[PDB]
Protein backbone atom coordinates (compact mmCIF):
# COMPACT_ATOMS: atom_id res chain seq x y z
CA UNK A 1 0.00 0.00 0.00
CA UNK A 2 1.21 3.49 -0.87
CA UNK A 3 -1.13 5.31 1.46
CA UNK A 4 -2.32 5.85 5.00
CA UNK A 5 -5.79 4.35 5.17
CA UNK A 6 -8.55 6.86 5.72
CA UNK A 7 -6.20 9.55 4.43
CA UNK A 8 -6.86 11.89 1.50
CA UNK A 9 -5.61 10.77 -1.90
CA UNK A 10 -4.77 12.61 -5.10
CA UNK A 11 -6.01 11.42 -8.47
CA UNK A 12 -3.89 9.14 -10.61
CA UNK A 13 -1.87 8.35 -7.49
CA UNK A 14 -0.25 4.98 -7.03
CA UNK A 15 -2.00 3.26 -4.15
CA UNK A 16 -1.09 -0.43 -4.20
CA UNK A 17 2.04 -1.39 -6.05
CA UNK A 18 1.43 -4.82 -7.55
CA UNK A 19 3.99 -7.49 -8.44
CA UNK A 20 5.43 -6.55 -11.82
CA UNK A 21 7.16 -9.91 -12.28
CA UNK A 22 5.35 -10.95 -15.46
CA UNK A 23 4.71 -7.32 -16.42
CA UNK A 24 8.10 -5.63 -16.07
CA UNK A 25 9.26 -8.78 -17.80
CA UNK A 26 6.42 -8.40 -20.29
CA UNK A 27 7.37 -4.77 -20.64
CA UNK A 28 10.76 -6.09 -21.69
CA UNK A 29 8.97 -8.00 -24.42
CA UNK A 30 7.84 -5.12 -26.64
CA UNK A 31 11.04 -3.37 -25.61
CA UNK A 32 13.33 -5.65 -27.58
CA UNK A 33 10.80 -5.93 -30.36
CA UNK A 34 10.69 -2.16 -30.34
CA UNK A 35 14.46 -2.38 -30.18
CA UNK A 36 14.29 -4.96 -32.95
CA UNK A 37 11.43 -3.24 -34.77
CA UNK A 38 13.39 0.01 -34.97
CA UNK A 39 16.39 -2.10 -35.96
CA UNK A 40 14.76 -3.06 -39.24
CA UNK A 41 13.73 0.50 -40.07
CA UNK A 42 17.26 1.49 -39.09
CA UNK A 43 18.75 -0.47 -41.97
CA UNK A 44 15.85 0.49 -44.20
CA UNK A 45 16.36 4.18 -43.53
CA UNK A 46 20.09 3.50 -43.66
CA UNK A 47 19.39 2.08 -47.11
CA UNK A 48 17.01 4.81 -48.24
CA UNK A 49 19.52 7.49 -47.30
CA UNK A 50 22.12 5.75 -49.44
CA UNK A 51 19.74 5.21 -52.36
CA UNK A 52 18.86 8.87 -52.04
CA UNK A 53 22.51 9.65 -52.60
Amino acid sequence: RNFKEGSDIEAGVSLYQIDPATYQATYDSAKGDLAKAQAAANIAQLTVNRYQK
Binding site: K4, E5, G6, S7
Partner: protein
Protein backbone atom coordinates in the same frame (compact mmCIF):
# COMPACT_ATOMS: atom_id res chain seq x y z
CA UNK B 1 -1.06 14.85 18.59
CA UNK B 2 -4.58 14.89 17.17
CA UNK B 3 -4.07 11.15 16.66
CA UNK B 4 -6.23 9.96 19.50
CA UNK B 5 -5.76 7.39 22.22
CA UNK B 6 -7.99 4.33 22.32
CA UNK B 7 -8.53 1.74 25.03
CA UNK B 8 -10.26 -1.59 25.36
CA UNK B 9 -12.13 -3.72 27.84
CA UNK B 10 -11.17 -7.15 26.61
CA UNK B 11 -13.93 -9.75 26.52
CA UNK B 12 -13.00 -10.94 29.98
CA UNK B 13 -14.18 -7.45 30.91
CA UNK B 14 -10.58 -6.62 31.68
CA UNK B 15 -9.28 -3.59 29.83
CA UNK B 16 -6.50 -4.25 27.36
CA UNK B 17 -3.16 -3.57 29.05
CA UNK B 18 -2.10 -0.54 27.00
CA UNK B 19 -4.07 1.81 24.82
CA UNK B 20 -3.82 1.79 21.06
CA UNK B 21 -3.40 4.18 18.20
CA UNK B 22 -6.55 5.43 16.55
CA UNK B 23 -5.30 5.32 13.01
CA UNK B 24 -7.50 7.20 10.58
CA UNK B 25 -11.01 8.44 10.09
CA UNK B 26 -12.96 6.67 7.43
CA UNK B 27 -15.68 8.52 5.63
CA UNK B 28 -17.97 5.56 5.13
CA UNK B 29 -21.65 5.25 5.88
CA UNK B 30 -22.94 1.72 5.98
CA UNK B 31 -26.43 2.06 4.59
CA UNK B 32 -27.96 -0.16 7.27
CA UNK B 33 -25.76 1.38 9.96
CA UNK B 34 -24.75 5.00 10.13
CA UNK B 35 -21.40 3.39 10.77
CA UNK B 36 -18.61 5.90 11.18
CA UNK B 37 -16.42 2.86 11.68
CA UNK B 38 -12.76 3.70 12.20
CA UNK B 39 -9.61 1.72 12.76
CA UNK B 40 -7.24 2.24 15.67
CA UNK B 41 -4.25 -0.05 15.17
CA UNK B 42 -3.16 -1.68 18.38
CA UNK B 43 0.10 -3.22 19.59
CA UNK B 44 -0.01 -6.94 20.35
CA UNK B 45 3.34 -8.15 21.71
CA UNK B 46 1.76 -11.16 23.46
CA UNK B 47 -0.62 -11.93 20.58
CA UNK B 48 -3.55 -11.64 22.97
CA UNK B 49 -5.32 -9.57 20.40
CA UNK B 50 -6.25 -12.46 18.11
CA UNK B 51 -7.89 -10.47 15.32
CA UNK B 52 -11.44 -10.96 14.14
CA UNK B 53 -12.82 -11.10 17.66
Amino acid sequence: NGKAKVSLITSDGIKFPQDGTLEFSDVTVDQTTGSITLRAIFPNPDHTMMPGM
